[PDB]
Design a protein around this ligand. Structure first.
Ligand SMILES: *[C@@H]1O[C@H](CO)[C@@H](O[C@@H]2O[C@H](CO)[C@@H](O[C@@H]3O[C@H](CO)[C@@H](O)[C@H](O)[C@@H]3O)[C@H](O)[C@H]2NC(C)=O)[C@H](O)[C@H]1NC(C)=O
Ligand SMILES: *[C@@H]1O[C@H](CO)[C@@H](O[C@@H]2O[C@H](CO)[C@@H](O[C@@H]3O[C@H](CO)[C@@H](O)[C@H](O)[C@@H]3O)[C@H](O)[C@H]2NC(C)=O)[C@H](O)[C@H]1NC(C)=O
Ligand SMILES: *[C@@H]1O[C@H](CO)[C@@H](O)[C@H](O)[C@H]1NC(C)=O
Ligand SMILES: *[C@@H]1O[C@H](CO)[C@@H](O)[C@H](O)[C@H]1NC(C)=O
Ligand SMILES: *[C@@H]1O[C@H](CO)[C@@H](O)[C@H](O)[C@H]1NC(C)=O
Ligand SMILES: *[C@@H]1O[C@H](CO)[C@@H](O)[C@H](O)[C@H]1NC(C)=O
Ligand SMILES: *[C@H]1O[C@H](CO)[C@@H](O)[C@H](O)[C@@H]1O
Ligand SMILES: [Cu+2]
Ligand SMILES: [Cu+2]
Ligand SMILES: [Cu+2]
Length: 539
């Protein structure tokens, strides 16, 4: 039993970095939050535009808690013309399926003017984020940081918090969706680093291009070790984060602490999080912070300006003249060999489920999973079906039923030919990356090459373009769990499926059943006169 501190980050009282947090949870306290989903106007980069925000800021307010705390988060939808539904990214929701926030799966949408109070315990610690999982809303700024304090696998003095990395349009994503769904995502007008960037409005005739955008700035005190919590939250952005003339000691991936490793740059797919410790041991100077936008992965109009500024002297106003490390320049994830959980777990005996991604064109460009593109009915979410004792779901719900062989290995194959590295997010579980391969899956040979012995473990991992991703998870969380590409266009285009896991073992408190019913009653009251119908997959 030791206290967490700058020289004992492994400690968490009677618990520690060695505690199995899948099986053991500290007692904490209840923390209550009130969030308002708003229709806003912001100027993050000297361009004024609309946004959909929590509480009028991009990013939204920080939700900060300790490992074990119970969170009560009242979410009121103050948009006029969209439902909304908020997901707590990577959060296991063991026994709280109905608060996972996936509209069409775990809830009906929150109708305009309605409130839904999300309740869940945090049985994980580290860096994550919360965001709307209702259509493309997070692309208009509807996300915020969710930081759960706990132990760490390397010592550090100061936690600077999250640095968000994203693309950023100069108009609502909902304005460009009709063009994007023809099949080619647009190059967006800029990027943001923790909510800010420069933009040259000097030659603009657009009255909204008011200028004054500023670089993200981070100040170091020489000798201090800083925890930076990196999240890629773009619509369709890949990053390779780096700080010139500094080394990153990587200590967590998503919500899983790893054996520290050092790296000059850090590949980060959408929805992925890393925790790094940077020691401020360079010559004191201004250094460029590089997002290293992956131009081979997706387009942006201003890729080279996905940068911020590290200062050792905060009174300096000069731009860095530092020289960047040459990026690997791929759309890959960090190498599997680098991502070794500190808490070592092995994958047990399993049953294999194989699915294949392709594309089709119906009304617009769609992605298919075993020939079916996800299309959900917001007024009949999977959980509603489950509470009605339905076990056969619509084809377009892309349900795979799991029932106990205590483990599943889920192989998803890219048969599209496109060579996109798709960030695949699984809800309700950390998975084990048993293979992440650039090659064709062979059901007779590939399983023999799976790594079942402490493989990487996280909640978002790349399906390699033209390859396969084999992820294992244990049947330990009855529910209906969405799995999808986190490239927002692709999710909206149906690149998703869901696991209905141990359906008959789902338990929901009567109070939460009543709440769920109320949410859907209110949604159903809104839809007859909504201005805008569902026009994508729902998620
Ligand atoms: C959620 O609310 C947003 C409003 O904030 C809705 O966005 C609207 O979406 C419609 C349908 O896609 C857009 O119409 C299209 O606009 C483009 C661009 O001018 C045009 O080329 C198309 O032919 C079509 O008219 C509309 O622009 C857009 N409105 C705004 C202000 O962005 C969205 O549909 C809502 N979704 C739900 C599910 O309630
Ligand atoms: C990126 O932008 C956000 C601001 O949009 C910064 O978020 C800030 O993060 C820090 C550290 O995690 C938060 O500090 C904590 O505040 C709470 C509540 O009062 C307190 O309990 C803790 O002791 C700690 O001071 C801070 O709340 C938060 N600010 C906002 C507005 O949410 C973040 O720091 C930026 N990243 C960098 C590297 O600058
Ligand atoms: C968010 O905004 C709403 C509406 O004004 C308010 O009730 C709530 O307290 C605010 N929450 C935070 C965290 O500021
Ligand atoms: C947000 O406000 C804008 C400007 O009034 C409006 O055009 C748009 O429909 C609103 N969006 C939603 C989702 O309510
Ligand atoms: C998806 O299709 C492939 C190829 O036909 C088949 O091998 C696999 O079992 C299918 N998966 C499921 C879950 O239906
Ligand atoms: C679902 O099954 C349970 C268990 O038998 C039963 O109590 C409940 O009423 C059922 N509900 C419906 C709507 O079929
Ligand atoms: C993470 O660790 C692996 C194995 O040592 C390296 O191959 C990689 O480049 C990174 O350091
Ligand atoms: Cu997410
Ligand atoms: Cu994708
Ligand atoms: Cu998701």
């Amino acid at each position: 039993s030791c206290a967490n501190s700058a020289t004992s980050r492994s400690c968490w009282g009677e618990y520690s970095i060695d505690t199995n947090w899948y099986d053991v949870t500290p007692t904490g306290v209840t923390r209550e939050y009130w969030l308002s989903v708003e229709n806003s106007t912001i100027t993050p980069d000297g361009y004024t535009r609309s946004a959909m925000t929590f509480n009028g800021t991009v990013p939204g307010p920080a939700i900060i808690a300790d490992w074990g705390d119970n969170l009560i988060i009242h979410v009121t939808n103050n948009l006029e013309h969209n439902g909304t539904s908020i997901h707590w990214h990577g959060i296991r929701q063991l026994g709280s399926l109905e608060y996972d926030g996936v509209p069409g799966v775990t809830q009906c949408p929150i109708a305009p003017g309605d409130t839904l109070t999300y309740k869940f315990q945090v049985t994980q610690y580290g860096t994550t984020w919360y965001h709307s999982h209702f259509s493309l809303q997070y692309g208009d700024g509807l996300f915020g940081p969710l930081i759960i304090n706990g132990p760490a696998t390397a010592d550090y003095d100061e936690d600077v918090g999250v640095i968000f990395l994203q693309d950023w349009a100069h108009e609502s994503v909902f304005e460009i969706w009709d063009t994007a769904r023809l099949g080619a995502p647009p190059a967006l007008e800029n990027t943001l680093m923790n909510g800010t960037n420069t933009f040259d409005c000097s030659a603009s005739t657009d009255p909204n291009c008011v200028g004054g955008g500023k670089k993200f700035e981070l100040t170091f005190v020489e000798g201090t070790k800083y925890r930076l919590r990196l999240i890629n939250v773009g619509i369709d952005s890949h990053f390779e984060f780096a700080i010139d003339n500094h080394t990153l000691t990587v200590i967590a991936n998503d919500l899983v602490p790893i054996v520290p490793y050092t790296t000059d740059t850090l590949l980060i797919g959408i929805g992925q999080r890393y925790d790094v410790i940077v020691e401020a041991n360079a010559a004191a100077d201004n250094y460029w912070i590089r997002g290293n936008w992956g131009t081979t992965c997706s387009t942006n109009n201003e890729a080279a300006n996905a940068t911020g500024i590290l200062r050792y002297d905060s009174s300096s106003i000069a731009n860095p003249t530092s020289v960047g490390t040459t990026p690997r320049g791929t759309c890959e994830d960090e190498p599997v060999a680098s991502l070794v959980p500190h808490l070592a777990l092995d994958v047990g005996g399993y049953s294999l489920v194989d699915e294949q991604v392709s594309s089709a064109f119906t009304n617009y460009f769609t992605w298919t999973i075993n020939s079916s593109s996800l299309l959900l009915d917001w007024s009949s979410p999977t959980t509603l079906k489950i509470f009605n004792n339905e076990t056969i779901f619509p084809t377009e719900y892309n349900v795979v039923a799991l029932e106990q062989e205590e483990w599943v290995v889920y192989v998803i194959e890219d048969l599209t030919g496109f060579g996109i590295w798709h960030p695949i997010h699984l809800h309700g579980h950390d998975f084990f990356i048993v293979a992440q391969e650039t090659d064709v899956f062979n059901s007779d040979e590939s399983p023999a090459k799976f790594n079942l012995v402490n493989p990487p473990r996280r909640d978002v991992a790349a399906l390699p373009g033209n390859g396969y991703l084999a992820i294992a998870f244990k049947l330990d969380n009855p529910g209906s769990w969405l799995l999808h590409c986190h490239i927002a266009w692709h999710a909206s285009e149906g690149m998703a499926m869901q696991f209905v896991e141990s359906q008959s073992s789902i338990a929901v408190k009567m109070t939460d059943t009543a709440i769920f019913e109320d949410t859907c009653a209110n949604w159903n009251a809104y839809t007859p006169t909504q201005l805008f119908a569902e026009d994508d997959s729902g998620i």
